[PDB]
Amino acid sequence: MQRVTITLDDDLLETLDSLSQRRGYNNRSEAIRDILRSALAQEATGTQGFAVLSYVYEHEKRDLASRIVSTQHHHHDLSVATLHVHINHDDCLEIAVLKGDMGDVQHFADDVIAQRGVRHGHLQCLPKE
Amino acid sequence: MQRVTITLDDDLLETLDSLSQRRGYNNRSEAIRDILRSALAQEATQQHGTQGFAVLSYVYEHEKRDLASRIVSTQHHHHDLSVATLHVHINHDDCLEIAVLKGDMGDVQHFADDVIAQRGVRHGHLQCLPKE
Amino acid sequence: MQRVTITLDDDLLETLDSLSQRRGYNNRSEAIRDILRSALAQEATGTQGFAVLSYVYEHEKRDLASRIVSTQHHHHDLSVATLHVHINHDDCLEIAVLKGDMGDVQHFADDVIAQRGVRHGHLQCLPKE
Amino acid sequence: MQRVTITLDDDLLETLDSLSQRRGYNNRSEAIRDILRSALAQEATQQHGTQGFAVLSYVYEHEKRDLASRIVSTQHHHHDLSVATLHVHINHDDCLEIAVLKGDMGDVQHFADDVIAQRGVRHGHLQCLPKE
Ligand SMILES: OC[C@H]1O[C@H](O[C@H]2[C@H](O)[C@@H](O)[C@H](OCCCC3CCCCC3)O[C@@H]2CO)[C@H](O)[C@@H](O)[C@@H]1O
Ligand SMILES: OC[C@H]1O[C@H](O[C@H]2[C@H](O)[C@@H](O)[C@H](OCCCC3CCCCC3)O[C@@H]2CO)[C@H](O)[C@@H](O)[C@@H]1O
Ligand code: NI
Ligand code: NI
Ligand code: NI
Ligand code: NI
Ligand code: NI
Ligand code: NI
Ligand code: NI
Ligand code: NI
Ligand code: NI
Ligand code: NI
Ligand code: NI
Ligand code: NI
Ligand code: NI
Ligand code: NI
Ligand code: NI
Ligand code: NI
Ligand code: NI
Ligand code: NI
Ligand code: NI
Ligand code: NI
Ligand code: NI
Ligand code: NI
């Protein structure tokens, strides 16, 4: 067993402690060691497949409604279908199911979320494997 | 029962006959009686004061005139009637969209119009399933 | 202008009259003439395109949940994606978006709705034209 | 601020290093600090007593063992948490499904488990967007 010293800010530690107590850990190291185990295990996650793109945006702002649909049409091949739920008067929750090469999928995601007016962008890839 | 006579013009009649022919009908009363029942029956499912769910389909060419931004804005104005919308990019220009609505079958009718009656939207189609 | 005499049962006429009065028609003929106009106009509705299949079914009954998904997988090519809303504890509202030759679409619809356990089956075809 | 020392075993560490390498990290505190914040932050969005919406994705092979009938039955048991589910037939065996949920972020967590924790379901993934 090796050792590693990290520096953490007060608020993070305050939440982490609140959690280590309740979740039944003897101390910070024990609790952090556990989060690492799960997190790294998820890193066991090739060129083609499907993907789920989630994100929230406001239809008005920079005419995003039109922009995001136009964008998706430029890559309509990669697009399978898009689910959309109106959450409030301004925001919209959208989920685009994508098919094709992961490279194209990665690019598609950027065209949609890496821009002003879009929040909570999330992309899960499901490669053929 | 009760017999009723309808006054039809030469044109409307030549129509009812070629289409009834194509659809296997050999008799006008039958062709007309079904069209009628089919109508009044759909007329029903739409009444106000009845709850339920509905399916609204339609195709639109996103570019035109902010139909995307206006179609989406219209659904937000009535967000309480919307459950979720499914959109499929048909080709570089056409958008197939399907919206599930729940609530008063009446208000739904309105909603279908506010959208289906928008310059640029075609193939509109509603289907109300009263909660029974 | 030609003439056509049809026979209608009491209840239908009772609804039709209630309607002709309120909707402002002078009589049955005037009201029926109007329904015909619209109905026949809709008959202006070739081999390929998309379609929307709607229907309601109860997940339990004859294991429909599994059957309808298995069915759709036999024709997964014609299937683009399927929306599903749980309406109550027993019934489900499902809408399948279909792509392909109308012939295949017509067949697909029968495999899904023309059977016990399924209600309100509806199919709108959108051919490439 | 505050410095903390973690006791790691040779294996967990060789892991954190090859994966941090692949991801461009050159320092362990940074690799670990982000993993941590990312975790506690997601831990948050899930609390009970907060409303909102969520996205639940997962893949399943419909045949297996009535996973179709059981997955769908489970969603009906909690129908109030469901908004709508989107299903895509990946291939002759795999079903990609996406369910939108709204309500207490807490109950949602449960729901994700009742399904994601079903023999035959893989690639499960939740994303809670607290109504703020
Ligand atoms: O688009 C990718 C995702 O990016 C962010 O989450 C990332 C976060 O930005 C990243 O820092 C973390 O990785 C933790 C950093 C640890 C690395 C991986 C393992 C080896 C060492 C570095 O993963 C999460 C998702 O799981 C967003 O919060 C999420 O909504 C989005 O979908
Ligand atoms: O699957 C096709 C549709 O079949 C039924 O509606 C049909 C009805 O069964 C038919 O009888 C009527 O046609 C009226 C009969 C008139 C014919 C057409 C014109 C020429 C003469 C005959 O159309 C409606 C739909 O529009 C169902 O109620 C509907 O949910 C379903 O989607
Ligand atoms: Ni050691
Ligand atoms: Ni193209
Ligand atoms: Ni919206
Ligand atoms: Ni409101
Ligand atoms: Ni691009
Ligand atoms: Ni996989
Ligand atoms: Ni009589
Ligand atoms: Ni589109
Ligand atoms: Ni309105
Ligand atoms: Ni119809
Ligand atoms: Ni019914
Ligand atoms: Ni005449
Ligand atoms: Ni095949
Ligand atoms: Ni259901
Ligand atoms: Ni209930
Ligand atoms: Ni078949
Ligand atoms: Ni057309
Ligand atoms: Ni300090
Ligand atoms: Ni499937
Ligand atoms: Ni439960
Ligand atoms: Ni995530
Ligand atoms: Ni937010």
PDB file of N, CA and C in Angstrom, chain A residues 25-26 28 44-45 47 51 60 68 97 108 126:
ATOM      1  N   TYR A  25     -17.780   5.611   7.149  1.00  0.00           N
ATOM      2  CA  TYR A  25     -16.362   5.433   6.890  1.00  0.00           C
ATOM      3  C   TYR A  25     -15.617   5.990   8.091  1.00  0.00           C
ATOM      4  N   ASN A  26     -14.480   5.401   8.425  1.00  0.00           N
ATOM      5  CA  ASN A  26     -13.723   5.865   9.577  1.00  0.00           C
ATOM      6  C   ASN A  26     -13.062   7.224   9.393  1.00  0.00           C
ATOM      7  N   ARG A  28     -11.477  10.354   6.091  1.00  0.00           N
ATOM      8  CA  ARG A  28     -11.377  10.852   4.733  1.00  0.00           C
ATOM      9  C   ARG A  28     -10.741   9.860   3.775  1.00  0.00           C
ATOM     10  N   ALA A  44     -13.672   1.678 -17.652  1.00  0.00           N
ATOM     11  CA  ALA A  44     -13.532   0.448 -18.416  1.00  0.00           C
ATOM     12  C   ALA A  44     -14.622   0.532 -19.483  1.00  0.00           C
ATOM     13  N   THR A  45     -14.794   1.700 -20.024  1.00  0.00           N
ATOM     14  CA  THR A  45     -15.878   1.951 -20.848  1.00  0.00           C
ATOM     15  C   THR A  45     -15.555   1.729 -22.307  1.00  0.00           C
ATOM     16  N   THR A  47     -15.095   2.121 -32.809  1.00  0.00           N
ATOM     17  CA  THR A  47     -15.106   3.130 -33.865  1.00  0.00           C
ATOM     18  C   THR A  47     -16.524   3.419 -34.343  1.00  0.00           C
ATOM     19  N   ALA A  51     -25.059   6.520 -29.496  1.00  0.00           N
ATOM     20  CA  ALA A  51     -24.717   7.426 -28.411  1.00  0.00           C
ATOM     21  C   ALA A  51     -25.979   8.173 -27.975  1.00  0.00           C
ATOM     22  N   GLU A  60     -35.585  30.573 -27.093  1.00  0.00           N
ATOM     23  CA  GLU A  60     -35.540  31.957 -27.561  1.00  0.00           C
ATOM     24  C   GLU A  60     -34.107  32.431 -27.768  1.00  0.00           C
ATOM     25  N   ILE A  68     -30.045  24.559 -33.578  1.00  0.00           N
ATOM     26  CA  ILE A  68     -29.822  23.164 -33.220  1.00  0.00           C
ATOM     27  C   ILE A  68     -30.518  22.188 -34.175  1.00  0.00           C
ATOM     28  N   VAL A  97     -30.668  10.638 -30.080  1.00  0.00           N
ATOM     29  CA  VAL A  97     -30.070   9.308 -30.199  1.00  0.00           C
ATOM     30  C   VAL A  97     -29.248   9.326 -31.473  1.00  0.00           C
ATOM     31  N   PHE A 108     -20.401  15.758 -33.573  1.00  0.00           N
ATOM     32  CA  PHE A 108     -21.807  16.132 -33.503  1.00  0.00           C
ATOM     33  C   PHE A 108     -22.126  16.784 -32.145  1.00  0.00           C
ATOM     34  N   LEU A 126     -21.982   4.389 -26.808  1.00  0.00           N
ATOM     35  CA  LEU A 126     -22.225   2.958 -26.747  1.00  0.00           C
ATOM     36  C   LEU A 126     -21.629   2.369 -28.026  1.00  0.00           C
TER      37      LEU A 126
END
